[PDB]
Paper text:
RAS proteins are binary molecular switches that cycle between active guanosine triphosphate (GTP)-bound and inactive guanosine diphosphate (GDP)-bound states. In the active state, RAS proteins interact with a variety of effector proteins, such as RAF kinase, PI3K, and RalGDS, leading to activation of downstream signaling pathways. The role of magnesium as an essential cofactor for small GTPases is well established as it is required for both high-affinity nucleotide binding and GTP hydrolysis. To examine the effect of N-terminal modification on the tertiary structure of KRAS, we carried out structural studies on KRAS constructs containing iMet (unprocessed N-terminus), lacking the iMet (partially processed N-terminus), and KRAS lacking the iMet and with N-acetylation of the second amino acid (fully processed N-terminus).
Among the two KRAS constructs made, we obtained crystals using KRAS (2–166) that diffracted to a resolution of 1.5 Å. Like the Mg2+-free KRAS-GDP structure, no electron density corresponding to Mg2+ was observed in this structure. Unlike the Mg2+-free KRAS-GDP structure, the switch I region in Mg2+-free KRAS-GMPPNP structure is close to the nucleotide binding pocket. Also, in this structure, we did not see a register shift of amino acids in the β2-β3 strands present in the interswitch region. This is likely due to interactions between the gamma-phosphate and residues present in the β3 strand. Structural comparison of Mg2+-free KRAS (2–166)-GMPPNP with previously solved Mg2+-bound HRAS (1–166)-GMPPNP (the switch I region in active state 2 conformation that is compatible for effector binding) shows that partial closure of switch I and a structural rearrangement at the beginning of the switch II region causes the side chain atoms of Q61 to flip away from the nucleotide binding pocket. In the Mg2+-free KRAS-GMPPNP structure, side chain atoms of A59 point towards the Mg2+ and sterically clash with water molecules coordinated with Mg2+. This clash results in the loss of Mg2+ from this structure. Thus, the structure of Mg2+-free KRAS-GMPPNP provides a probable intermediate snapshot of the SOS-mediated nucleotide exchange process where it likely displaces the Mg2+ using residue A59 before displacing GDP.
Residue numbers in the entry: 0 to 166
Amino acid sequence: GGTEYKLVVVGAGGVGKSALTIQLIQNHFVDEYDPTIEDSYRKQVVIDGETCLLDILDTAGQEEYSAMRDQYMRTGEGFLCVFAINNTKSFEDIHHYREQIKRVKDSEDVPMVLVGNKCDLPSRTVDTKQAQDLARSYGIPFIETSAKTRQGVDDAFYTLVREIRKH
Ligand SMILES: Nc1nc2c(ncn2[C@@H]2O[C@H](COP(=O)(O)OP(=O)(O)NP(=O)(O)O)[C@@H](O)[C@H]2O)c(=O)[nH]1
Ligand code: NA
């Protein structure tokens, strides 16, 4: 079959995991999203001239520690770790998501991208420099996004695929 990349989107409640997923897949911004038991979506894209299938797995609605969250992390080949640039707590939580991924994968070297979403909103509390320093510590890219204005959305997911392809 065509090459498929299972990309898992993680982050604190309300950061925009689902809006990012739906913007990528459907090309629409949602004002609200109700997670279900399984929220995954597939779409063909071309990245660096190579066609592939993205299967996006959204962890929205999963509890912080649960069998289904672990199953999603076991299945994922790459991870978007999302915070919101107007919510400091969601940025402080990033280390937690990275630790959970490293635990489930039993590895320090897992394809990941740090995503700072909601860059369109006025009340920024996290600087790009802060996010870049965290990303540098983890050895991963940082991408700023807005699911609303569409800034950076493709870049975040496509960068994650590039990270998977480098391993
Ligand atoms: N202005 C703005 N609002 C956004 C952005 N991304 C998401 N939102 C809004 O933020 C709220 C939460 O988004 P949602 O995608 O449900 O976040 P989530 O991380 O999946 N939440 P949960 O894990 O609680 O289900 C929604 O009202 C959505 O419209 C963005 O980039 N900009
Ligand atoms: Na899109």
